[PDB]
């Protein structure tokens, strides 16, 4: 087959706080903003946020899709090298070596990942400014030492039902069996490498395994991030149940479940995309394995 889509690449900033994604909304923080509009509706003391989510959040959403779109020219050059290294027919037409072509892939791949971060650096400062507005909006609450946690605990019940609509049990079994076939495919092609005079086809399988290795790690990251949100929120429903907290403790409560649930939905969108990529690249390996003898 052929790698028709390369939406599995991503990039994080130097602080590793913000994770860029090619899929919308490109930020797990935007899902947190979508969830705070739900928090502000239950509070009759916060009414200015409806206009913030309608302008400041939509501007950050569109600027994110725009900043990702600028790297489309760089994305196609990286994708083009992926299709050359994995297809022996396309590689046999070009004149450069495989070591040179593989090093170009590693250089261009980081150029695309570096583009997504650098073009979104202005948006990274925009996310921080919206968080300070939310923290300032919570300060305007009338409660000081008597802030009710009913809205905070009612949201935990809503989240746990939404967590059940997640095939976490199916993803863990899938990734554990996919790796067993992966390392078996690794050890297999190296044993075969020394017994077959077919350098291009073997190298194409090696390169796909390098691509698969990157996607398996991105799959395990989001899969472990979905689990942490499910387990930590569950721990909140089985912990203390304070009737009234301080306004400072209330801000931390909304930012806790708000950040937990946003990472959950952000990982669910990525795990779906990363699942199709793992299946697709596994098909490309077997199509290359069947092409080992001839054609």
């Amino acid at each position, epitope marked *: 087959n052929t790698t028709d889509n390369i939406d599995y690449f991503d990039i*994080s900033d130097e602080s590793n706080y913000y994770l860029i994604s090619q899929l919308r909304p490109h930020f797990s923080n935007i899902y947190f903003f979508d969830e705070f509009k739900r928090y502000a509706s239950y509070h009759t003391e916060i009414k200015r946020y409806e206009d913030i989510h309608k302008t400041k959040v939509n501007s950050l959403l569109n600027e994110a899709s725009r900043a990702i779109g600028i790297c489309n020219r760089a994305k196609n050059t990286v994708k083009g090298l992926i299709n050359i290294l994995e297809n022996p027919q396309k590689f046999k037409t070009q004149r450069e070596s495989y070591d040179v072509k593989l090093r170009q892939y590693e250089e261009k791949k980081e150029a695309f990942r570096g583009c997504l971060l650098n073009k979104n650096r202005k948006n990274l400062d925009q996310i921080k400014k919206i968080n300070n507005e939310i923290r300032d909006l919570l300060e305007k609450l009338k409660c000081s030492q008597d802030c009710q946690t009913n809205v905070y605990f009612d949201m935990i019940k809503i989240y746990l039902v939404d967590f059940k609509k997640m095939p976490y049990e199916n993803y863990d079994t899938f990734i554990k069996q996919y790796k*067993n076939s992966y390392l*078996s495919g690794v050890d297999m092609i*190296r*044993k075969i490498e020394k017994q077959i005079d077919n350098p291009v086809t073997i190298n194409a399988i090696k390169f796909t395994q390098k691509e698969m*290795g990157y996607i398996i790690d991105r799959f395990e*990251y989001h899969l472990q991030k979905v689990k942490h949100s499910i387990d930590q929120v569950t721990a909140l429903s089985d912990g203390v149940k304070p009737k009234q907290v301080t306004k400072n403790r209330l801000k931390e409560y909304y930012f806790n479940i708000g950040n937990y649930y946003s990472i959950f939905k952000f990982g669910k969108d990525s795990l779906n995309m990363l699942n199709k990529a793992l299946i697709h690249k596994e098909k490309i390996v077997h199509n290359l394995l069947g092409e080992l003898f001839g054609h």
Partner: antibody
Amino acid sequence: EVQLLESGGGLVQPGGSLRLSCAVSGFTFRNYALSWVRQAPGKGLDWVSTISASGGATYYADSVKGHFTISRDNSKNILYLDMKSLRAEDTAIYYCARDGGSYTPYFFLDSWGQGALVTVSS
Amino acid sequence: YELTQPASVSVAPGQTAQITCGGNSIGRKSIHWYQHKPGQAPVLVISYDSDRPSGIPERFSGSNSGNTATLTISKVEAGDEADFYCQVRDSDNDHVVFGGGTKLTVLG
């Protein structure tokens, strides 16, 4: 060049706890899988635990699952090893080593460190 | 899984060293060899049966067939004196397994 620098090892009492650290120079910390391998006095290399490049998966040894815990910090680019309950069997030199595979561990070691001595005695 | 390694091997300088690593159906697994000088960092000499990373001389060689894999050093020097370890990954429980170790003593 590529090198890994251990630090934190020393004297621990039986039952105490130690936090081992490992710095990196020569490559990007986020893109490679790391692991710990220890060598007891008069014994060979004993594999302890490995971790994925992003922390998605972690692997341990049977004689290790109880106490040792892998920790990663892709921001500060530091690799940790927390030892919960130290016994006399854990006196060894611990080598910070990185996996030669791409992001997910291929389970063969690419580079190694000089080692950090950990002594367990009162 | 268990890998078996002769504890000691003696070589005269200039001869060829052959360190063996054994196990059941070894010819179906990928084996990597490590050199370890005391006080220094171990070095991956041979990986995946026969491959050698950059910076490793052609004197080092690797084979693997049947029940044993052999690490071969063609023109042994006094600087190659170190204990060597073979390494395979146990795909069942998914962790790294090392051999017992083999002290390589060059008779200088």
